[PDB]
Design a protein around this nucleic acid. Structure first.
Lengths: 111, 328, 111, 122, 110, 111
RNA sequence: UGGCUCUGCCAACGCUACGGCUUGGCGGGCUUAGGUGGUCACGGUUCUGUCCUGCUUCGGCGAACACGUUACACGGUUCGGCAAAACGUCGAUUACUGAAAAUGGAAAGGCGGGGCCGACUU
RNA sequence: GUGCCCAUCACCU
RNA sequence: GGGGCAGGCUGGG
């Protein structure tokens, strides 16, 4: 869209510094996290053009996957990369883009 | 090995043994629904099987009973891969503590003895001893007549581990008269059972020239009246003690040939059985007039192994002259 | 429930296998990157499954778990360097099986 | 005990994967022998080799013939990779024998895929 | 037509690829993803031109929009900067040119 | 038409040697060029398992993308470029595959 | 595994927010088992050739062309000597220990040859 | 489906 | 007369 991406830019702007703090050791998880984080913009964008709700649910799945990545980076990554606080603040930003995605889902499935 | 064997369920359920059992159970069967449904979570399955066996909650799944006629009208009950694996895990600890008391001259389902070490034993023991005669006997319906009760007086004079014994009794109940044909557990326990007649031939009866292959028992002699005695004593035993009826028997001069184990074993030669020839002859002829002259090379290579023992040089020349194919 | 439960149970698979999948030597790096994408990427399969209830989505969650079990098998094979030891396969297969149980119940629920 | 069930059990997917695991078990060793240079080709070959399992697996669980044909396309791409690793890779990658061996294994998986495609097509 | 957009997008690549190779190793994932968005949007245009679903002409637009995201993202990614606010301005001009062509092309199809 | 693949496999045989050549410096371009070059076989293969013109156009797009890669790798700077000869002497190879693809597209379009 | 979100140094495609970054060299660090087959433990009827129709210890074994049913020659299917040991087996899940053999537990001995030792061959 | 052999197939000691 | 071999013809497959 435009506003979802601008609100998701805040997620990236918060999480990308967190994703760059992940040590070399967990470099492949980082690359995968960064491709989930920075690659969700493409998911939002492609839904923005091709308005089919199919593309809109993939954006939701990506946000949900990004929420998993917060869970994963906070704990499953052994040097728990994301501190619990950072998960809380990130989940607030993801929730804001989640709200917009939900409203957008609703606007599309009006009938 | 200690004449007591009194802690085998510890070794039967050793992970290292169930992995052997698993690899033995899957060997050859890696294209079956059983392997491939088991293979999925293989080591998690062996962890719930190990812990079923260790607990004494292993229960053998129902036999999937089909039947083939190509060898002979049978009644082949299969087991689930889980069940054939438990049997393989038993018959890795339990088999070598039975197959070690089997007198040398039992040639069935024990490693390093076979069809081919048996026919050779008979031929050999025919050449030496200069047998004038031989008793060949055979047990009516062997497996479907094994006591499964006086079997568990032999599977119990040796197991002594009261949990292996209860695993043996799940994998083969201690009541009835029918060791299932199409069980690894059952090949073993039939060799054991019959092994009772081996220790009525070799122990009692002091017969030193014999061979048993599961239910068939060759007993080379020199006095054909003694070999008829031996047989009578063998039949009376295996009927009174083991509930085995002797289907066919004969006390032929070593001259009729000992129709033992797929061969016809004189001292000097060892013709295979005409059935085998005719089956092979027909198999080859079919292969030719089926356009399948490339799987015939595989069959030929196989039958060239079953017949490398037999005196099948003439026959191999003959089959090379009839169809051309490289037999040997 | 359902998606939330499956993911929390699958997080245990990830929590177990991600350390194993980060140990796979750069040598087996494509196998590792593909294993990590299969391990961390099965969350997306579950996530998509509980955003549709399309029972095909829970079957492709099963396909992913089956692919993850392949990876265990494979990484236990890979003889160069080496990875998932037969034990690690055993432990992981138990975790994936618990996830398998939940996926099966979920498939049946939807059926 | 009853072995830990997966859902959507497809004998064909299970069989094809066990047979394709032999392709991997053969080709993965010689995919890893491809030198440092020709690493992108290797990574792409390894993603084709190890990633065909996912193609079979998704074909088995998502019983849709599209995923079976996608599995066929991947086996065809794997056959290309043999051609490529033999001919176009310059040091060597794959000795002619290894292509002959691998093509036999892929052919076995090809047979099973064909049978599976056919049984679904009916 | 695909030929025109691609030749004008080649100018975006020719400008951004040098810049996208200069994005620090620290921001290596972002760089490799930016490079795969930059070179890789050519495939989006080319697929759109050598076929026609419009969806492919939207996926080309989404890629251009993602490339614009990458510019704004790389501009102020961290202390290892990647794209100066200026390099973004120059690149946005070239992407705008291919944006205009894509828009006209979307319109001519619509 | 599977002369397509066997005429494209000489494009590969020409372009792969000079695609491996592309230095780590131009590594993303190389990986993407190699994925375009070696991965066009999959495009042809998918086209030939379907004869759906969509897959035939995707094969055309890939050949057009491969032609882009030649022009891109030409202007890639340094003693690391594709020499102007190679760009021309591969565009000839790709053109041969292009001719066959065009005929194949036409064969399908005028059934 | 053409790595490293990795450093020191030196350069220059370049890019710089002028700090650097990028990139390149240059050191250091991090990096037998299995598969597949195939042997051994579908018939029914008349017809046309083709051969057998023998044996029996009465259980059955054959035969009818593998045709010298046999590579008419042996397989280590060899020959001796032993049988102490180990193995097997009975003794024995006995004696013994201990409330109980309870997932302890012998042996003397008896029987084997499966074992042993040579020879010659493998 | 069970075992015993045979062949062939990979793959290094 | 019976019997085996290889072909007739019909099922199984």
């Amino acid at each position: 869209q435009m506003l979802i991406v601008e609100r998701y830019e805040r997620v990236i702007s918060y999480l990308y510094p967190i994703a760059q703090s992940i040590p070399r050791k967990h470099g492949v998880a980082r690359e995968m996290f960064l491709k989930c984080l920075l690659g969700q913009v493409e998911l939002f964008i492609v839904a923005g053009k091709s308005n089919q709700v199919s593309k809109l649910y993939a954006a939701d799945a990506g946000l949900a996957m990004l929420r998993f990545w917060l869970r994963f980076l906070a704990g499953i990554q052994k040097p728990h990369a994301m501190t619990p606080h950072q998960v809380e603040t990130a989940q607030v930003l993801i929730a804001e883009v989640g709200r917009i995605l939900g409203s957008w889902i609703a606007r599309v499935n009006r009938k | 090995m200690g004449k007591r064997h009194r802690n085998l369920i510890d070794q039967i359920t050793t992970w290292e043994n169930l992995l052997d059992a698993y690899r033995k159970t899957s060997h050859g069967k890696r294209r079956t629904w059983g392997y491939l449904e088991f293979k999925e979570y293989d080591l998690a399955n062996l962890l719930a099987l190990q812990a079923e066996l260790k607990a004494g909650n292993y229960e053998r799944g129902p036999y999937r009973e089909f039947l083939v006629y190509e060898p002979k009208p049978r009644l082949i009950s299969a087991l689930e891969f889980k069940d054939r694996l438990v049997q393989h895990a038993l018959c890795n600890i339990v088999a070598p503590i039975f197959e070690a008391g089997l007198l040398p001259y039992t040639y069935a389902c024990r490693p390093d003895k076979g069809t081919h070490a048996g026919v050779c034993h008979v031929q050999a023991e025919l050449r030496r001893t200069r047998a004038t005669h031989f008793l060949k006997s055979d047990f009516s319906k062997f497996f479907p007549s094994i006591d499964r009760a006086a079997l568990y007086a032999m599977i119990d004079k040796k197991i002594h581990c009261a949990a292996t014994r209860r695993l043996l009794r799940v994998v083969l109940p201690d009541e009835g008269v029918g060791i299932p044909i199409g069980s690894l557990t059952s090949q073993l326990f039939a060799n054991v059972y019959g092994g009772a007649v081996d220790r009525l031939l070799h122990d009692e009866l002091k017969q030193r020239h014999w061979a048993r292959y599961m239910d068939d028992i060759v007993v080379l002699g020199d006095d054909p009246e003694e070999l008829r005695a031996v047989f009578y004593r063998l039949r009376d035993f295996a009927s009174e003690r083991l509930g085995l009826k002797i289907s066919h028997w004969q006390v032929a001069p070593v001259s009729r040939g000992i129709n033992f184990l797929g061969y016809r074993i004189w001292p000097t030669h060892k013709l295979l059985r005409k059935s085998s020839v005719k089956r092979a002859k027909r198999k080859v002829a079919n292969f030719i007039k089926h356009g399948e002259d490339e799987s015939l090379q595989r069959f030929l290579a196989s039958w060239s192994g079953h017949a490398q023992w037999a005196d099948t040089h003439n026959l191999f020349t003959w089959m090379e002259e009839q169809y051309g194919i490289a037999c040997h």
